[PDB]
Design a protein around this ligand. Structure first.
Ligand SMILES: Nc1ncnc2c1ncn2[C@@H]1O[C@H](COP(=O)(O)OP(=O)(O)O)[C@@H](O)[C@H]1O
Ligand SMILES: Nc1ncnc2c1ncn2[C@@H]1O[C@H](COP(=O)(O)OP(=O)(O)O)[C@@H](O)[C@H]1O
Ligand SMILES: [Mg+2]
Ligand SMILES: [Mg+2]
Lengths: 91, 529, 774
């Protein structure tokens, strides 16, 4: 989506809250206003863990797209069609 | 027509999805090697490592085949986030990488495309092997997510996210090397530096000493400002042309266009934050923006066709990707990257704005009855054979004989138009009629009047018949002869079938004579005589 | 005197392998448009030298005249040249695949590549005789003496190309006909096995600069195979223009055609600027006038253009004028004009037999046209398609197999039965509109067939014995193929008349259904009243046989493109019946008016007046009436034969007038939805409109072999037009014709007036039985 509230956009906001942990430390050398978020996102171990979460999110969506489709088949079509078209089909 | 179109990969061994991967065209062959493969088939025993696997890229009629080359001489070690560039059309090096986060390489490793053999360069990298801290011989301090621009006989690296020992930061500094010997010289500009950034792109602009460094990232705060650097006079000039939104970990490729060289940035992560704190929210943009170097300005580009979807079917953003451009087919192609997940989907697009090498026409105005030869200019214009231009357009289809004066110049005669309406000029070849913004053409008193004879200029007019001959230039015109003298001049007038006049004159006196010839109550080019 | 064995053909084979002759010519000539030859690698050379020598020197079967029955008398070198050009084109296509393969599978390919190259070089020109099918099956067994690379069984050697990636001998794959909406049937082109394996061989001789020649019976469909290829070429690579030889096409007339095609390069050179390939497709190669000695001037010119490439400019005969980047695509038919052309040209060409219609090739063309066109009409009455196409062959075969009845002879010169007839049978079935045929088609179709068959064979026939022989075959065909034999009453009958104007007149929409004679008698009589009232008055009787004649001339004008040819003894009223037939249809007859002093240039302004009326868009299709008397000299026909052969007579205008006639039909093409400002499809689309809106009805008499010598000189007259023969008036007709004229004469008891008109017929019938006795 990227709009309103969605299971991904919530899990996106969740995922974020752990990267937000970078800020709280506020660096141990050089400049005071520095972050760690950059370094944490270069670490290979975290990428793999982040990429594994996204793979599992795309699994459910496909089987949920098959689950919803079942009802959609006969049922979407009737809400699209009008009463006049129903009249034209009859006579 | 410009539109994003997915390309299906069909090979014996297709490449697995990656993030730390770089693609660089060299001669007529595009070669990709890259690491960070989701699939633990490399190292294993806990943690993900890079793969040092090379792959060739071939594409024909929108169909790609992948072909990896195991057989080399030496092998380099597995890299992730590692700037590569091309020397000449043979010698591809790669420099700098990463290995289990804490270890970072600072060793160059050449590859000869024709032999697909790697090598260690002279005695510059005697002993490689993986190590947290490497600071000797080589000037540059080990770094990942950096950038390498190639120029005539010299490679330049500006990129960041790295340091000696355990320290981690972005680089303010530019390290030069001379490929002829592989000597590492740090070059400090006299100009006031740009803020230290890592995870960007840089490339030479318009085949000039200036190279431009857009986007980037740093522990302090992300940046999003272009910064050029001419090797001549050392000090960098600052355009100070920024983007709308701050961008980082993008991927940009240079494109040749004769009128004005164009640069194309795709993917990356954007976000606007105030100094320290937060920075956590990371939006990724699919929309690739377009820069012209002669303009120095960022103009966003839109899809023309939706392919009957009735909605823009663009690829995912993919943050850290790899994009390479073909000068043959005039298209930019990006393999994939890391938009949170890993994906193996090669998406291309053909650039409408770039065309095989005017722009402008002169004259753009003409009379219908006349037959003049114009001059259409642009770029990628074929010489003699294949060259074909479109005429009229105003409720009509016309094809005019074209001749290429240059590769940026095409001569063609104006077609006889019945109605004085709106005229449009195109060009035919490629898929159908590959053109830009069409060259706009716009189609009784005659300004043309040609005269020559011994009855004009100095000649003293005697009893003898002093002759001239005009041009009719015809369907209602007037042609008034006038011979003022001291005595009574004779004056004849014979309209011939050669499309000319024959006006003699016999003045009886001789003192300083001068004959005026008017066409529609207006003097012809020549006066007096 | 050079002997053939002294010089040989080996020196060419060795010089082609080493790339010795080829290499020198490319370097040391103006010919910069030479298609670069492939690299004959050290192995690839050995494998051909080893093979060429092993399938020519060694094979006695290959050179045995009785085993390998050629059409034209191929010279040995002419065959070696065609092998070499095909081997060139195979290598260039499969060179990077060969170099990736290993020693054993590379060798077996290069061997197969020869066998296939040879197969066409030798087996291609195999054909002719009576049974082309047997002269193929005689060759099929000798070239199935093919050393290491054996054929698959259950197929001729022709039906197999060597695929590099399977290494099998796959069989040629044929693209199933998709129904287009071409109104001209001549544009319809159904791919067969034979038409794809020629399409390849034309691409193999265009990739090289090797001119091709197709040789096959008058109506085999050679022109169509090439006229498809030229249409499917790219307009930037190839530029195609046909030269249809007329007998009178002298060496001057060819040079004007070639000079019009070719532009002016730098110096004395003449090619296409931008190195295009300028195809000059000769059709009817044999036709050129054979002088007393036996040497055709235009043909000898071509042998000056192929060899040295230098046409002496007929004005200023000092200027050499060198010609460049030309190919020539011949379409010679054996059994017409100069049966064969000088072997000194046929050498330069690769010859490719086009075989007389097979039982399969007919079923894959006309099967595919009807199945497509009856998917339209009805879901039922498809299964009738193959049943009718089985029949239209069965009948077509039992005509060709009985040669003593129906064979092309001096008196039977128009009895030529080939694809042309099966095309305008399958055209006449393609006129069935869905409303007036849909439903039970068991009977209605098979009549429409019987009729369409009948009136493109009966029409042809002279002798009534031949008309009887036909109707026996036609009622055998219907007992086997259509197999119903519906009743005791045959679908075939005497009063079977089908007409598309009888429906129109009443007020019904684009029917081609059968009327009965008394319905046809009301409509025609009403339409003759309507022609007397508006045009110059022509009184004719309309008896059943003249009734039928309008019926079967209105049919030949309605079929778009198809030009009528009414043969009959002068006085038959062929001219008068045509004028009626024309007025029945919404068409406007244009007859030229010959004075005693008439010139070719004045004909060419009368023809050019007609071509200003057709070329305007909303045009009532003008008919063009010609007779035996109107053609004072044999020259006037030359323009006319080019009109009825295709579209419009080449060079009847300047190229400035034709750039304005094209422009008037740009406002029609946008309305049709055809591509505009292409200037290749627009010129083509206009030629289709001119062909459609011009009908050419010529009206000859078969007396003193003046028609036969015309048919010999102009290929157009007989083959390109749908002949309809005018027999002498039946006894039933004469009694009517007499009685109409005896009206407005007094007679005592009116019983006399009928009775006289019996004896007026009998006398005229009783002279014809004495005239035969005499
Ligand atoms: N495959 C085909 N599809 C459609 N019509 C065909 C086909 N083959 C032959 N014909 C028709 O056969 C007729 C006679 O053949 P044509 O091409 O005129 O050459 P030729 O004089 O050599 O027989 C033409 O009307 C042509 O359209
Ligand atoms: N059915 C008929 N009834 C009466 N007269 C006829 C009939 N058919 C033909 N004729 C006459 O015979 C003439 C033959 O001359 P013409 O029309 O020039 O034909 P042709 O082409 O045979 O010379 C016709 O003009 C007409 O007067
Ligand atoms: Mg033909
Ligand atoms: Mg006549």
């Amino acid at each position: 989506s990227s709009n309103q509230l969605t299971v991904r956009n919530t899990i996106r906001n969740w995922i974020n809250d752990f990267f937000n942990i970078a800020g709280t430390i506020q660096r141990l050398d050089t400049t005071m206003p520095g972050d760690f978020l950059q370094e944490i996102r270069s670490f290979f171990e975290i990428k793999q863990c982040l990429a594994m979460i996204t793979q599992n999110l795309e699994w459910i969506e496909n089987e949920c797209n098959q689950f919803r489709a079942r009802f959609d088949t006969y049922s979407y079509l009737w809400t699209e069609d009008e009463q006049i078209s129903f009249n034209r089909f009859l006579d | 027509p410009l539109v994003w179109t997915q390309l299906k990969q069909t090979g014996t061994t297709q490449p697995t999805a990656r993030s730390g991967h770089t693609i660089i065209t060299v001669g007529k062959t595009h070669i990709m090697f890259g690491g960070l493969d989701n699939d633990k088939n490399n190292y294993k025993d806990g943690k993900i490592a890079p793969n040092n696997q090379v792959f060739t890229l071939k594409l024909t009629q929108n169909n790609c085949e992948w072909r990896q080359i195991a057989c080399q001489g030496d092998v380099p070690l597995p890299r992730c986030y590692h700037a590569s560039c091309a020397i000449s059309a043979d010698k591809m090096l790669v420099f700098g990488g990463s290995y289990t986060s804490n270890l970072r390489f600072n060793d160059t490793y050449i590859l000869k495309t024709t032999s697909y053999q790697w090598s260690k360069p002279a005695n510059q990298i005697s002993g490689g092997e993986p190590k947290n801290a490497e600071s000797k011989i080589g000037a540059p301090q080990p770094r990942y997510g950096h950038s390498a621009t190639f120029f005539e006989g010299k490679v330049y690296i500006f990129g960041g996210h790295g340091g000696i020992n355990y320290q981690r930061l972005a680089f303010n500094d530019l390290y030069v090397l001379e490929t002829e010997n592989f000597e590492w010289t740090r070059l400090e500009p006299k100009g006031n530096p740009p803020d230290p950034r890592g995870g960007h792109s840089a490339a030479m602009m318009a085949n000039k000493p200036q190279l431009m460094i857009f986007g980037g990232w740093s522990f302090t705060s992300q940046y999003s400002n272009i910064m050029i650097y001419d090797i001549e006079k050392d000090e960098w000039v600052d355009p100070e042309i920024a983007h709308e939104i701050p961008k980082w970990n993008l991927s940009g490729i240079m494109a040749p266009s004769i009128p004005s060289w164009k640069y194309f940035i795709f993917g990356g992560s954007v976000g606007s934050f105030e100094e320290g704190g937060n920075r956590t929210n990371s939006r990724f943009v699919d929309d690739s923006f377009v820069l012209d170097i002669d303009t120095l300005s960022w103009s966003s580009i839109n899809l023309e066709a939706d392919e009957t979807s009735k909605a823009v079917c663009k690829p995912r953003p993919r943050e850290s990707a790899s994009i390479f451009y073909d000068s043959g087919e005039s298209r930019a192609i990006v393999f994939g990257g890391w938009a949170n997940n890993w994906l193996n989907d090669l998406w291309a697009l053909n650039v409408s704005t770039i065309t095989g090498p005017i722009f402008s026409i002169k004259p753009a105005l003409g009379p219908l009855t006349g037959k003049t030869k114009v001059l259409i200019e642009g770029d990628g214009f074929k010489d003699t054979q294949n060259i074909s231009v479109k005429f009229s357009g105003g409720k009509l289809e016309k094809e005019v004989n074209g001749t290429f004066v240059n590769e940026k110049e095409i001569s063609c005669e104006t077609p006889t138009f019945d109605y004085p309406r709106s005229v449009e000029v195109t060009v035919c070849m490629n898929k159908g009629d590959y053109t830009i913004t069409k060259s706009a053409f716009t189609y009784t008193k005659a300004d043309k009047t040609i005269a020559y004879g011994p009855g004009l200029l100095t000649e003293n007019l005697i009893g003898v018949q002093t002759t001239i001959v005009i041009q009719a230039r015809n369907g209602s015109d007037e042609f008034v002869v006038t011979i003022r003298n001291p005595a009574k001049i004779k004056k004849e007038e014979e309209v011939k079938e050669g499309d000319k006049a024959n006006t003699k004159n016999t003045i009886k006196e001789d003192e300083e004579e001068e004959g005026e010839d008017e066409e529609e109550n207006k003097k012809k080019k020549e006066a007096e005589k | 005197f050079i002997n053939e064995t002294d010089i040989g053909w080996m020196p060419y084979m060795n010089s082609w392998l080493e790339r010795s002759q080829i290499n020198i010519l490319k370097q040391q000539k103006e010919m910069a448009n030479m298609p670069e030859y492939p690299v004959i690698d050290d192995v690839a050379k050995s494998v051909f030298y080893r093979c060429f020598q092993s399938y020519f020197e060694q094979n006695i079967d290959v050179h045995d005249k009785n085993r390998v029955r050629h059409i034209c008398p191929m010279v040995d070198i002419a065959m070696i040249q065609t092998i070499c050009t095909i081997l060139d084109a195979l290598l260039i296509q499969h060179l990077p695949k060969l170099k990736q393969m290993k020693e054993e599978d590379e060798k077996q390919a290069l061997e197969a590549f020869f066998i296939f190259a040879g197969l066409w070089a030798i087996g291609g020109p195999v054909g002719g005789g009576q049974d082309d099918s047997k002269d193929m099956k005689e060759f099929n067994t000798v070239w199935k003496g093919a050393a290491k690379v054996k054929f698959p069984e259950q197929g001729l050697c022709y039906d197999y190309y060597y695929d590099i990636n399977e290494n099998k001998w796959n069989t040629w794959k044929v693209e199933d006909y998709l129904p287009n909406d071409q109104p001209l049937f001549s544009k319809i082109y159904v791919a067969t096995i034979h038409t794809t394996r020629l399409r390849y061989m034309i691409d193999i001789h265009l990739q090289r600069r090797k001119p091709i020649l197709f040789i096959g019976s008058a109506g085999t469909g050679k022109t169509a195979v090439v006229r498809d290829y030229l249409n499917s070429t790219r307009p930037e690579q190839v530029s195609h223009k046909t030269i249809n030889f007329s007998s009178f096409t002298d060496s001057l007339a060819l040079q004007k055609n070639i000079e019009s095609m070719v532009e002016k390069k730098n110096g004395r050179n003449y090619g296409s600027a931008t190195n295009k390939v300028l195809i000059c497709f000769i059709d009817d190669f044999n036709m050129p006038y054979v002088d007393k000695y036996g040497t055709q001037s235009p043909i000898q010119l071509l042998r000056l253009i192929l060899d040295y490439g230098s046409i002496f400019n007929r004005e200023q005969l000092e200027e050499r004028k060198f010609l460049q980047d030309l190919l020539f695509f011949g379409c010679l038919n054996q059994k017409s004009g100069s049966f064969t052309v000088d072997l000194r040209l046929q050498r330069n060409f690769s010859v490719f037999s086009m075989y007389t219609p097979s039982s399969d090739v007919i079923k894959t063309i006309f099967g595919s046209i009807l199945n497509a066109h009856l998917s339209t009409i009805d879901d039922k009455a498809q299964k009738m398609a193959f049943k009718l196409v089985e029949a239209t062959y069965f009948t077509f075969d039992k005509i060709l197999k009985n040669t003593t009845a129906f064979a092309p002879s001096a008196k039977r010169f128009h009895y030529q039965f080939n694809f042309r007839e099966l095309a305008r049978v399958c055209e006449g079935i393609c006129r069935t509109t869905p409303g007036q045929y849909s439903g039970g088609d068991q009977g209605k179709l098979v009549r429409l067939w019987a009729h369409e068959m009948k009136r493109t064979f009966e029409d042809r026939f002279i002798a009534n014995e031949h008309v009887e022989f036909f109707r026996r075959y036609l009622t055998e065909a219907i007992s086997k193929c259509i197999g119903e034999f519906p009743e005791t009453e045959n679908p075939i009958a005497e009063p079977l008349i089908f007409t598309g104007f009888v429906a129109a007149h009443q007020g019904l929409d684009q029917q081609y259904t059968q009327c009965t004679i008394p319905v046809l008698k009301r409509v025609l009589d009403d339409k003759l009243e309507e022609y007397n009232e508006v045009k110059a008055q022509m009184n004719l009787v309309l008896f059943q046989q003249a009734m039928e004649h309008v019926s079967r001339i209105c049919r030949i004008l309605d079929m778009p493109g198809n030009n009528a040819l009414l043969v009959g003894v002068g006085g038959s009223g062929k001219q008068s019946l045509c004028r009626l037939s024309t007025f029945i249809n919404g068409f406007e007859i244009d007859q030229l008016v010959v004075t005693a002093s008439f010139t070719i240039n004045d004909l060419r302004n009368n023809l050019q007046e007609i071509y200003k009326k057709i070329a305007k868009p909303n045009s009532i299709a003008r008919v063009f009436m010609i007779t035996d008397s109107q053609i004072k000299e044999e020259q006037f026909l030359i323009p006319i034969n080019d009109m009825l052969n295709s579209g419009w007579i080449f060079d009847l205008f300047p190229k400035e007038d034709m750039d304005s006639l094209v422009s008037g039909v740009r406002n029609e093409a946008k309305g049709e939805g055809v591509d505009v400002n292409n200037l290749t499809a627009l010129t083509s689309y206009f030629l289709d409109k001119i062909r459609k809106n011009l009908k050419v009805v010529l009206c000859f008499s078969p007396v003193g072999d003046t028609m036969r010598i015309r048919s010999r000189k102009f290929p157009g007259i007989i083959n390109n037009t749908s002949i309809d023969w005018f027999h002498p008036w039946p006894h039933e007709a004469l009694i009517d014709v007499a009685f109409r004229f005896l009206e407005e004469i007094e007679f005592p008891t009116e019983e006399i007036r009928q009775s006289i008109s019996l004896n007026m017929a009998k006398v005229h019938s009783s002279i014809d039985t004495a005239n035969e006795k005499f």
